[PDB]
């Protein structure tokens, strides 16, 4: 089993008046555990999972200092990139950053990563080997040399293979009641007559965790994609997820069709009939 800790930053310039809006959220796998929001009163990194409140005042003081620093780096960035891209001061613009680390089944560092976007487009990302950068354009080529020169990668590497993974292990342990618990989907099937000749079969997966899931219809033991609808996975809003898939079939023929569920919470795939 691999697990991930990830951090997602967003800054939207507010030209006309003020500093940019800065929202920062942290996740372990599919669980959010911290947030910061420049519009909030506290001006503090805030807890969003029960198991992180375990952490002392000095954690919240450490995290807050670091994340206000990050909002300032994004503030400079927005201005630097307005100029790189020869944009006016009139318009609103966005920077987005994501970084994180994974551990493997050995509980050891498995993976690291870091990506940057300007107005919704790649700008610069760290390479998988964590020694070097990938610039999307000639602007980003300026940033790459600056960061090469500053030895940013080596310091980012030290963090992701160290501090990041260490604290990941910490959170997994502290919140194992939920972070290390898999909820298998609660499945069922519904049937609706659209006419006298035809009917809709809808296969539901409710209340599962993680979010990763596979739902497919088979007819007489072969996959069927024709005449189906498959909604995107959606949060229930209690930390679990939902999904469904539907097929349109001739009335009286429902027995040919099986729904097939794949999920980590299940040791063996599930098969459902009418």
């Amino acid at each position: 089993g691999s697990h991930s800790m990830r951090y997602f930053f967003t800054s939207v310039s507010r030209p006309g008046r003020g500093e940019p809006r800065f929202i920062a959220v942290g996740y372990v796998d599919d669980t959010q555990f911290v947030r910061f929001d420049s519009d909030a009163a506290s001006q503090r990194m805030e807890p969003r999972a029960p198991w992180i409140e375990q952490e002392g005042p000095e954690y919240w003081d450490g995290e807050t200092r670091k994340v206000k620093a990050h909002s300032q780096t994004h503030r400079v960035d927005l201005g630097t990139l307005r100029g790189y891209y020869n944009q006016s001061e009139a318009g609103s613009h966005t920077v987005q950053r994501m970084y994180g680390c994974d551990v493997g089944s050995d509980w050891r560092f498995l993976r690291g990563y870091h990506q940057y976007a300007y107005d919704g487009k790649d700008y610069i990302a760290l390479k998988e080997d964590l020694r070097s950068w990938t610039a999307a354009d000639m602007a980003a080529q300026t940033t790459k040399h600056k960061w090469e020169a500053a030895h940013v990668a080596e310091q980012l590497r030290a963090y992701l293979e160290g501090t990041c993974v260490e604290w990941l292990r910490r959170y997994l342990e502290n919140g194992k009641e939920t972070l290390q618990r898999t909820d298998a989907p609660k499945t069922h099937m519904t049937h609706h007559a659209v006419s006298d000749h035809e009917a809709t079969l809808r296969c539901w997966a409710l209340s599962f965790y993680p979010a990763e899931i596979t739902l497919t219809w088979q007819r007489d033991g072969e996959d069927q994609t024709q005449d189906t609808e498959l909604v995107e996975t959606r949060p229930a809003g209690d930390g679990t997820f939902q999904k469904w898939v539907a097929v349109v079939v001739p009335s009286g023929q429902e027995q040919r069709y099986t729904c097939h569920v794949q999920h980590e919470g299940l040791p063996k795939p599930l098969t459902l009939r009418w």
């Binding site: 951090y7 954690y59 995290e63 670091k66 990050h70 960035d77 630097t80 990041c164």
Partner: peptide, 9 residues
């Protein structure tokens, strides 16, 4: 636990 991020683009 976040990184200390102080490099600008």
């Amino acid at each position: 636990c976040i990184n200390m991020w102080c490099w600008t683009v």
